[PDB]
Design an enzyme around this catalytic site. Structure first.
Site, PDB file in Angstrom:
ATOM      1  CE  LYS A   7      -2.249  -1.184   3.629  1.00 60.75           C
ATOM      2  NZ  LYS A   7      -1.651  -2.546   3.645  1.00 60.75           N
ATOM      3  CB  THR A   8       3.741   2.258   2.100  1.00 60.01           C
ATOM      4  OG1 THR A   8       3.067   2.258   3.364  1.00 60.01           O
ATOM      5  CG2 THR A   8       4.779   3.353   2.096  1.00 60.01           C
ATOM      6  CD  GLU A  35      -0.476   3.553   3.770  1.00 59.55           C
ATOM      7  OE1 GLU A  35      -0.590   4.409   4.681  1.00 59.55           O
ATOM      8  OE2 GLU A  35       0.304   2.576   3.843  1.00 59.55           O
TER       9      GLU A  35
END
Ligand code: T4L
Ligand code: T4L
Lengths: 301, 301
Positions: A109-110, A153
């Site tokens: 996600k990051t 996110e």
């Protein structure tokens, strides 16, 4: 309901949200134990800032945002039935005001959010994005939230996961890390990702990594428009001819009805290939040029 | 060619190999700058140990194993055309003497090897295994190599990768970490895994994780017997009904012509589910009981 009050507004997870709310035209107040350059900047942007903790600071607030239930502002609100919302819940609420891109999946996600922000900024769009619960806008000259776009996110262990309202949603992969959030049952965890993608409007878009066997399994349940991606021969958007030149990874991206596009990224591993494929799906669906895609991907470190 | 001489035989990567060679009935000599409990144990097992570095120590050696080409033992050997073999090359050679289980794949080699060793020891077999280049035999009362079985990581960045001679080979996954070993070209890297599995004898067994899209792509090229595993609906050996009880992960293993077997492992993540599936494929093919499988998997930390 116009006035929002943050207890501990100088926190690093809190000031960004207040700034966006100021940018949306809300009346915003906050308290904190000490004045800082953060509260000062929020005051320069229109926030009313108290430097004590006392019930009077909560006066007039329509909602509280907090990150200690014995704190007198919260008690005054609770006793007055003023809603008291966790910081994470108000963060997720911001997506209703913008064109929200939710980056879900247990892993990646990051990086995938930062790559999306990287390409969109290369395309002139100056997006706001959320990593680790912090609102961000790389090199922006504006209040957080100025952009039409909000990339965030979407953590499945987060209590607010199923109250995101994105226009576009990525699912990088589905792992079992957070089974304990869902009763310790991976099957309950998969059903939540299905429900999450159904928070999309019918005109929304779900971007699914079919290299993940669990993403691939739930794909036929998604009554929303989908683009699949991965190295799988049957992905809509694929990476082929993966190669390395120095500390840089090269590959050719295949896209339906487009010529193949050579891209490159400064990070090793098939997982960053996949992060870049997900980004390329988002950028392409949004109408961003190859130059911005190519530049956005190769600019990032 | 009976006599093998190790320069720096007290190294932690070197003593294990000498011990196995002693166990195979070879004459073994070694030099090192200082006597230690390691050299002493090798001498108790039949090794001749020199505590200097001098050309005379290389006399009579049929082969040298080293880990400094100006060192006089190596020069004396080189000048005498005695073969000089790297430590990693002799380590891989050991697999010819045993029933070798090669654990290949970019990720998960260390854990999958330890789980295999864990289950085999639960089954009474006391295997020798190699993690991080070190020969090991948990709790053994014997010289390294006593067991019929040798379980080893098979690193594709290792120069000796394609000279392993295993009876059984696992491929957990195929990533791009080591493209630089293969000219910077992932396609060259995939072709090596195909060649590696063809080092198996025709009666050997290839254990393939079809959840990896790159493993799944090369699978139809493998002219060797194969068992596939993963969460994919089409895996031969699958994990279903994944659940969590405490710090422990439970799942049901489906196996052709067997009743479903509930197992558990003390490590989180789908990747350790997959490590356990690979182990379960190996153990089952070898004839090990469910009790040893169940015990071996739940004993490991
Ligand atoms: C590890 C961690 C630091 C991470 C993961 C990551 N991204 C993604 N990882 C995965 N799964 C991976 C499991 O980790 C692997 C990667 C190799 C192909 C087989 C799957 N699938 C993905 N699809 N799209 C994005 C994305 N970035 N960083
Ligand atoms: C990360 C590192 C510490 C590792 C990996 C690992 N094992 C394996 N990892 C993988 N791929 C994984 C990529 O990391 C993921 C895991 C989740 C399902 C999608 C793929 N596939 C496998 N098949 N068999 C064993 C095995 N143990 N430890």
């Amino acid at each position: 309901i116009r006035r929002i009050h943050f207890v501990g507004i100088g926190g690093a997870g809190m000031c960004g949200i207040a700034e966006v709310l100021l940018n949306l035209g809300y009346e915003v107040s906050g308290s904190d134990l000490k004045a800082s350059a953060v509260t000062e900047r929020l005051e320069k942007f229109g926030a009313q800032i108290f430097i004590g903790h006392q019930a009077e600071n909560a006066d007039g607030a329509d909602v509280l945002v907090v990150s200690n239930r014995a704190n007198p502002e919260v008690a005054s609100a609770l006793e007055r039935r003023i809603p008291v919302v966790p910081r994470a819940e108000m963060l997720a609420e911001l997506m209703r005001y913008r064109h929200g891109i939710a980056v879900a999946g247990t892993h990646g996600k990051t990086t995938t959010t930062s790559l999306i922000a990287s390409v969109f900024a290369a395309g002139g769009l100056d997006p706001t994005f959320v990593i680790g619960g912090r609102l961000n806008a790389a090199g922006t000259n504006a209040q957080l939230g100025a952009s039409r776009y909000l990339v965030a996110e979407a953590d499945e262990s987060d209590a607010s996961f199923l109250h995101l309202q994105p226009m576009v949603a990525v699912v990088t992969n589905i792992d079992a890390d957070h089974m304990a959030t869902y009763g310790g049952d991976f099957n309950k965890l998969k059903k939540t990702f299905v429900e999450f993608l159904h928070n999309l409007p019918f005109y929304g878009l779900a971007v699914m990594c079919v290299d993940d066997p669990v993403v691939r399994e739930i794909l036929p349940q998604i009554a929303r428009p989908t683009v699949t991606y991965g190295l799988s021969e049957d992905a809509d958007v694929r990476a082929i001819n993966i190669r390395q030149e120095g500390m840089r990874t090269w590959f050719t991206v295949l896209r339906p009805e487009r010529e193949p596009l050579d891209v490159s990224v400064n990070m090793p591993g098939l997982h960053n290939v996949l992060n870049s494929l997900a980004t390329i799906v988002i950028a392409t669906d949004e109408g961003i040029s190859d130059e911005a895609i190519v530049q956005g991907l190769s600019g990032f470190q």
